[PDB]
UniProtKB/Swiss-Prot annotation:
Complete-protein stretch covered: 1 to 43 of 881
Binding locations of Zn(2+) 1: C11, C14, C21, C28
Domain statement: The 9aaTAD motif (residues 862 to 870) is a transactivation domain present in a large number of yeast and animal transcription factors.
Protein name in the entry: Regulatory protein GAL4
Residues annotated to bind Zn(2+) 2: C11, C28, C31, C38
PTM annotation, UniProt: Association between GAL11 and GAL4 may serve to expedite phosphorylation of GAL4.
Additional information: Present with 166 molecules/cell in log phase SD medium.
């Protein structure tokens, strides 16, 4: 019973665009604003 998620929080959309990610959930302010697919969970 230890650890499940990653350890560097930041959605896909912030990767590509090079954006800041307050990390609001599910989608940051970013994706919500542009209707995007905020996925901060790779594979
Ligand atoms: Cd983000
Ligand atoms: Cd996002």
């Amino acid at each position: 019973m230890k650890l499940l998620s990653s350890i560097e929080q930041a959605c896909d959309i912030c990767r590509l665009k090079k954006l800041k990610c307050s990390k609001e959930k599910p989608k940051c302010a970013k994706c919500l604003k542009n209707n995007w697919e905020c996925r901060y969970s790779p594979k």
